Design a protein around this ligand. Structure first.
Ligand SMILES: CCC[C@H]1CN(CC(=O)N2CCc3ccccc32)Cc2c1[nH]c(=O)c(C#N)c2-c1ccc(C)cc1
Ligand SMILES: [Mg+2]
Ligand code: NA
Ligand code: NA
Lengths: 315, 315
């Protein structure tokens, strides 16, 4: 249970996610729902909220990166963004609920190997989802198989009008965390940014997809003490893919090959080309993000480049 | 064995489809992949082609409408419009192969209850496909499961690069048979119709989708000896659903309700507001479409609107 200091600390992207076990992180997730007013406002059963989170945890696998601790991070970032940008002013509790609950469920039952792998290798998955985000489809399908189980049904006191709405909302947001759609989504978002209209449901739907996207890859925003380990974790998972592809005679992405990559090169690429554009467009709507999220993205890039000439002198 | 009155009758849309038993209709679909070049071309095995088709028979269901026979009508109709329109000049044999093969697999394993039931009943299927064309994804999914079996893999001898173009093609096509996407498809089709261009893959891709749709719903193009028994069938399914749907508290469509439908009324709008204006914008690119198809339609509309006043006098 929760230290009033921690209680404060948890809302900030600083927060050291490595000082926490699973079952403590679960106690943190429980807190966020209570704190955000979700439990009161959607008559969530407090036992059933605990049981669901266990049910959820249970169904993430032990991958180097795509494990429960990713999910917790993404959630905790969404919670963080909710306080930073005062999102409870700009969204309904039913939107807020959707964001949190998506965030938690978004990379569920991840097998460790992305869609590219799923597709190329004709996996039962990609067969079953016809090469359209077989992962991210599955994530949802699990997410609701879980919620179907009455003891893990935290929506049990929401009537069908509510549920239908949340279901669509979650399914959108989870499916947007395929990166194949990153520029697609980022373009459409910039288009609507010219004259952003908090009245306009398509604008908010985009905004929401962005927010979870920001979270689905916020790692580097955190302190580097905290952030860097994830990179190793990610790479470890990546090389674990390519080795199996190189084995089975399947395509290998340049970002996933042992020989071609370095930690320093790949992250410079990702920070400058993917992250800072996304967190820039979002800074337009919420200025308070420059300071808290762009700053330690700028720093993290400045570090990786000094680490680049150190990767270049050695080899 | 096929008599050459049959081998003549198959290439045109009149072809009566209630005569032939299953094993005989398989022979027709064999004839078509030899006759259209695809056996000679794609190095297709002559026994993997009779296994894949006997297999594909086993994985339709005994549905009042959406059955193997529906699969035959649509492909046999799809055959009819290769000669009719002379599509072997405009389209590649890849495009010819996809279109044929899609037609054959397009409503695979249909349970006889539409997207709107699966979803509203929160059925395993709907949960899995997240309300996104639940059936048209399931059909496509069952398809490529047969063609992953090595004793049915007709594409065995095809490259993955060819297979990958046959994949992300047959896919695009079967997901277009969700009439729920009808409106959306039509309008994007007339968007290109302004200035049509057989060079462009997209315009050509859109064309391909249109063509296959016209087939799923191509019953009243046929002679009303042949064409009218598919409105006793369609409704036998439609009612079976709306019996259970009322019986499980679930919304019922007007158009499926027992006591709001009389065959005639149903097909008049289904002809006036769906079939006619589709085939009309098919005919701008291929004029011979007018003669053969838009005719037996216009007359089936007349036939039904009189059949209407026999119904209206009675009630
Ligand atoms: C080895 C390079 C590390 C670098 C670049 N890399 C980018 C990448 O692999 N891909 C492959 C598909 C794609 C589409 C558009 C842009 C990039 C990429 C992955 C990544 C990086 N840094 C990160 O902090 C995170 C995080 N979170 C990710 C990351 C984030 C999400 C997921 C699903 C996977 C990886
Ligand atoms: Mg994911
Ligand atoms: Na687990
Ligand atoms: Na069967």
């Amino acid at each position: 249970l929760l230290s009033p200091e921690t209680i404060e600390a948890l809302r900030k992207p600083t927060f050291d996610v490595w000082l926490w076990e699973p079952n403590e992180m679960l106690s943190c997730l429980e807190h966020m729902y209570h704190d955000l007013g979700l439990v009161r406002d959607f008559s969530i059963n407090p036992v059933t909220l605990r049981r669901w989170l266990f049910c959820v945890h249970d169904n993430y696998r032990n991958n180097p990166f795509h494990n429960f601790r990713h999910c917790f991070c993404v959630a905790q970032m969404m919670y963080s963004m909710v306080w930073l940008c005062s999102l409870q002013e700009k969204f309904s509790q039913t939107d807020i609920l959707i964001l949190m609950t998506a965030a938690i469920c978004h990379d569920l039952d991840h097998p460790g190997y992305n869609n590219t792998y799923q597709i190329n290798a004709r996996t039962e998955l990609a067969v079953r989802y016809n090469d359209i985000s077989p992962l991210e489809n599955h994530h949802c399908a699990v997410a609701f198989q879980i919620l179907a189980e009455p003891e893990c049904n935290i929506f049990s006191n929401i009537p069908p009008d509510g549920f239908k709405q949340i279901r669509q909302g979650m399914i959108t947001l989870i499916l947007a965390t395929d990166m194949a759609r990153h520029a697609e989504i980022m373009d459409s978002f910039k288009e609507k940014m010219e004259n952003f209209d908090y009245s306009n449901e398509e604008h908010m739907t985009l905004l929401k997809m962005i927010l979870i996207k920001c979270c689905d890859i916020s790692n580097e925003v955190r302190p580097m003490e905290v952030a860097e380990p994830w990179v190793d974790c990610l790479l470890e998972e990546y090389f674990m893919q390519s080795d199996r592809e190189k084995s089975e005679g399947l395509p290998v992405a340049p970002f996933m090959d042992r020989d071609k990559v370095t930690k320093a090169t790949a992250q410079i690429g990702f920070i400058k080309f993917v992250l800072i554009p996304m967190f820039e467009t979002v800074t337009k709507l919420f200025p308070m993000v420059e300071e808290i999220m762009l700053q330690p993205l700028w720093e993290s890039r400045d570090r990786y480049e000094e680490l680049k000439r150190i990767d270049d002198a050695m080899k």
